[PDB]
Amino acid sequence: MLNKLSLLLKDAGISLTDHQKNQLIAYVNMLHKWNEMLVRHILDSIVVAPYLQGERFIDVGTGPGLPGIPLSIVRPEAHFTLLDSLGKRVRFLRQVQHELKLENIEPVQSRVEEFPSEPPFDGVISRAFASLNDMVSWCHHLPGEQGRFYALKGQMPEDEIALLPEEYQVESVVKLQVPDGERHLVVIKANKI
């Protein structure tokens, strides 16, 4: 009830068509039934949306759709595959897809490998892993030759970056100062050859 007002207050800086906001609104009512952390997860997912390069993305271990759903709402021209191992989450995501009438998402049940990934993704995102290294190791088969790994951290993840395999490079780090509210988006790519 008061979650929206807070979310509206936070969006101060991000534009959103009434349509996009209505989908977001419905999503919060559905997510609430599924269950201030919620608002914070929705906001984080939205602020990062602009930095995802490409048109084909996958959210590994999406759960009830975080950051996946909020991302699909604010990036209508991009396609988001929402992956989870538990059919219960996938079924929820399908309801959401129906309620908000999302046309750019694909709820799919499968573990990381059980997933085809025939046609590579431009971007892989996830909040299910303990560290950057874990994420890249588990999702390594997903990004195209030019695809990227996106991870949202709080303070500069110096140790985790240092623990990244030589075969992977931090292409960029986006320090976000909006909201404490310290946020760093790490963009990783596999080194060629």
PDB file of N, CA and C in Angstrom, residues 52-53 56-60 83 112 117 120-126 129 135-136 138-144 147-151 186 188:
ATOM      1  N   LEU A  52      22.294  -2.476 -19.531  1.00  0.00           N
ATOM      2  CA  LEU A  52      22.267  -3.779 -20.167  1.00  0.00           C
ATOM      3  C   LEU A  52      22.301  -3.578 -21.683  1.00  0.00           C
ATOM      4  N   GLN A  53      23.435  -3.900 -22.310  1.00  0.00           N
ATOM      5  CA  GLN A  53      23.594  -3.752 -23.761  1.00  0.00           C
ATOM      6  C   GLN A  53      23.130  -4.991 -24.512  1.00  0.00           C
ATOM      7  N   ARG A  56      18.799  -9.462 -26.079  1.00  0.00           N
ATOM      8  CA  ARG A  56      18.513 -10.806 -25.579  1.00  0.00           C
ATOM      9  C   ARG A  56      19.198 -11.056 -24.226  1.00  0.00           C
ATOM     10  N   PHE A  57      18.399 -11.121 -23.161  1.00  0.00           N
ATOM     11  CA  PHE A  57      18.930 -11.310 -21.813  1.00  0.00           C
ATOM     12  C   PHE A  57      18.365 -12.513 -21.069  1.00  0.00           C
ATOM     13  N   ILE A  58      19.077 -12.941 -20.031  1.00  0.00           N
ATOM     14  CA  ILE A  58      18.621 -14.051 -19.207  1.00  0.00           C
ATOM     15  C   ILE A  58      18.928 -13.768 -17.748  1.00  0.00           C
ATOM     16  N   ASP A  59      17.927 -13.975 -16.905  1.00  0.00           N
ATOM     17  CA  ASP A  59      18.039 -13.780 -15.465  1.00  0.00           C
ATOM     18  C   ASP A  59      18.131 -15.190 -14.884  1.00  0.00           C
ATOM     19  N   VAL A  60      19.318 -15.577 -14.418  1.00  0.00           N
ATOM     20  CA  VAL A  60      19.539 -16.918 -13.855  1.00  0.00           C
ATOM     21  C   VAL A  60      19.208 -17.002 -12.364  1.00  0.00           C
ATOM     22  N   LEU A  83      14.950 -17.553 -15.742  1.00  0.00           N
ATOM     23  CA  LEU A  83      15.284 -18.917 -15.361  1.00  0.00           C
ATOM     24  C   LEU A  83      15.259 -19.226 -13.868  1.00  0.00           C
ATOM     25  N   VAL A 112      20.847 -24.325 -14.606  1.00  0.00           N
ATOM     26  CA  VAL A 112      21.742 -23.645 -15.539  1.00  0.00           C
ATOM     27  C   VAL A 112      22.082 -24.395 -16.826  1.00  0.00           C
ATOM     28  N   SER A 117      20.244 -22.719 -24.437  1.00  0.00           N
ATOM     29  CA  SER A 117      21.185 -21.635 -24.683  1.00  0.00           C
ATOM     30  C   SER A 117      21.783 -21.782 -26.077  1.00  0.00           C
ATOM     31  N   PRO A 120      23.025 -17.712 -28.033  1.00  0.00           N
ATOM     32  CA  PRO A 120      23.643 -16.935 -26.950  1.00  0.00           C
ATOM     33  C   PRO A 120      22.904 -15.671 -26.522  1.00  0.00           C
ATOM     34  N   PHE A 121      23.198 -15.209 -25.310  1.00  0.00           N
ATOM     35  CA  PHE A 121      22.575 -14.003 -24.784  1.00  0.00           C
ATOM     36  C   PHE A 121      23.557 -12.833 -24.778  1.00  0.00           C
ATOM     37  N   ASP A 122      23.031 -11.629 -24.967  1.00  0.00           N
ATOM     38  CA  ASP A 122      23.851 -10.425 -24.969  1.00  0.00           C
ATOM     39  C   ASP A 122      24.208 -10.071 -23.536  1.00  0.00           C
ATOM     40  N   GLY A 123      23.371 -10.507 -22.607  1.00  0.00           N
ATOM     41  CA  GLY A 123      23.634 -10.219 -21.216  1.00  0.00           C
ATOM     42  C   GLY A 123      23.062 -11.239 -20.249  1.00  0.00           C
ATOM     43  N   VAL A 124      23.865 -11.597 -19.255  1.00  0.00           N
ATOM     44  CA  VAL A 124      23.455 -12.541 -18.230  1.00  0.00           C
ATOM     45  C   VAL A 124      23.427 -11.784 -16.907  1.00  0.00           C
ATOM     46  N   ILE A 125      22.324 -11.904 -16.178  1.00  0.00           N
ATOM     47  CA  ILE A 125      22.196 -11.219 -14.905  1.00  0.00           C
ATOM     48  C   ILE A 125      21.714 -12.191 -13.834  1.00  0.00           C
ATOM     49  N   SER A 126      22.120 -11.955 -12.593  1.00  0.00           N
ATOM     50  CA  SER A 126      21.710 -12.840 -11.513  1.00  0.00           C
ATOM     51  C   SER A 126      22.100 -12.310 -10.150  1.00  0.00           C
ATOM     52  N   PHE A 129      24.138 -15.821  -6.809  1.00  0.00           N
ATOM     53  CA  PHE A 129      25.486 -16.264  -6.456  1.00  0.00           C
ATOM     54  C   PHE A 129      26.224 -15.460  -5.387  1.00  0.00           C
ATOM     55  N   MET A 135      29.273 -16.647 -10.023  1.00  0.00           N
ATOM     56  CA  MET A 135      28.363 -16.303 -11.106  1.00  0.00           C
ATOM     57  C   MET A 135      28.934 -16.640 -12.481  1.00  0.00           C
ATOM     58  N   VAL A 136      30.136 -16.160 -12.773  1.00  0.00           N
ATOM     59  CA  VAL A 136      30.748 -16.385 -14.077  1.00  0.00           C
ATOM     60  C   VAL A 136      30.968 -17.873 -14.324  1.00  0.00           C
ATOM     61  N   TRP A 138      29.341 -20.535 -13.129  1.00  0.00           N
ATOM     62  CA  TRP A 138      28.057 -21.180 -13.368  1.00  0.00           C
ATOM     63  C   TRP A 138      27.347 -20.772 -14.647  1.00  0.00           C
ATOM     64  N   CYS A 139      27.492 -19.510 -15.038  1.00  0.00           N
ATOM     65  CA  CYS A 139      26.826 -19.003 -16.233  1.00  0.00           C
ATOM     66  C   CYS A 139      27.725 -18.865 -17.464  1.00  0.00           C
ATOM     67  N   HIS A 140      28.980 -19.298 -17.361  1.00  0.00           N
ATOM     68  CA  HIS A 140      29.929 -19.153 -18.474  1.00  0.00           C
ATOM     69  C   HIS A 140      29.466 -19.584 -19.863  1.00  0.00           C
ATOM     70  N   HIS A 141      28.584 -20.573 -19.930  1.00  0.00           N
ATOM     71  CA  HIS A 141      28.096 -21.092 -21.204  1.00  0.00           C
ATOM     72  C   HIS A 141      26.975 -20.266 -21.828  1.00  0.00           C
ATOM     73  N   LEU A 142      26.505 -19.255 -21.106  1.00  0.00           N
ATOM     74  CA  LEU A 142      25.399 -18.435 -21.584  1.00  0.00           C
ATOM     75  C   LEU A 142      25.697 -17.237 -22.487  1.00  0.00           C
ATOM     76  N   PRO A 143      26.710 -16.418 -22.153  1.00  0.00           N
ATOM     77  CA  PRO A 143      27.035 -15.245 -22.979  1.00  0.00           C
ATOM     78  C   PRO A 143      27.615 -15.570 -24.356  1.00  0.00           C
ATOM     79  N   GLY A 144      27.257 -14.759 -25.343  1.00  0.00           N
ATOM     80  CA  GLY A 144      27.794 -14.980 -26.669  1.00  0.00           C
ATOM     81  C   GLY A 144      29.275 -14.653 -26.596  1.00  0.00           C
ATOM     82  N   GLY A 147      28.845 -11.402 -25.448  1.00  0.00           N
ATOM     83  CA  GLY A 147      27.899 -11.242 -24.353  1.00  0.00           C
ATOM     84  C   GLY A 147      28.569 -10.814 -23.062  1.00  0.00           C
ATOM     85  N   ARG A 148      27.782 -10.346 -22.099  1.00  0.00           N
ATOM     86  CA  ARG A 148      28.347  -9.889 -20.836  1.00  0.00           C
ATOM     87  C   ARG A 148      27.646 -10.430 -19.594  1.00  0.00           C
ATOM     88  N   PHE A 149      28.365 -10.355 -18.475  1.00  0.00           N
ATOM     89  CA  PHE A 149      27.878 -10.773 -17.163  1.00  0.00           C
ATOM     90  C   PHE A 149      27.663  -9.489 -16.366  1.00  0.00           C
ATOM     91  N   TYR A 150      26.463  -9.325 -15.798  1.00  0.00           N
ATOM     92  CA  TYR A 150      26.129  -8.146 -14.993  1.00  0.00           C
ATOM     93  C   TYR A 150      25.889  -8.523 -13.524  1.00  0.00           C
ATOM     94  N   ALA A 151      26.589  -7.860 -12.607  1.00  0.00           N
ATOM     95  CA  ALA A 151      26.419  -8.138 -11.185  1.00  0.00           C
ATOM     96  C   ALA A 151      26.339  -6.844 -10.402  1.00  0.00           C
ATOM     97  N   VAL A 186      29.023  -4.326 -11.832  1.00  0.00           N
ATOM     98  CA  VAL A 186      30.215  -4.887 -12.456  1.00  0.00           C
ATOM     99  C   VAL A 186      29.820  -5.545 -13.767  1.00  0.00           C
ATOM    100  N   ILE A 188      31.284  -7.833 -16.710  1.00  0.00           N
ATOM    101  CA  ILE A 188      32.349  -8.770 -17.002  1.00  0.00           C
ATOM    102  C   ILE A 188      32.166  -9.433 -18.349  1.00  0.00           C
TER     103      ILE A 188
END
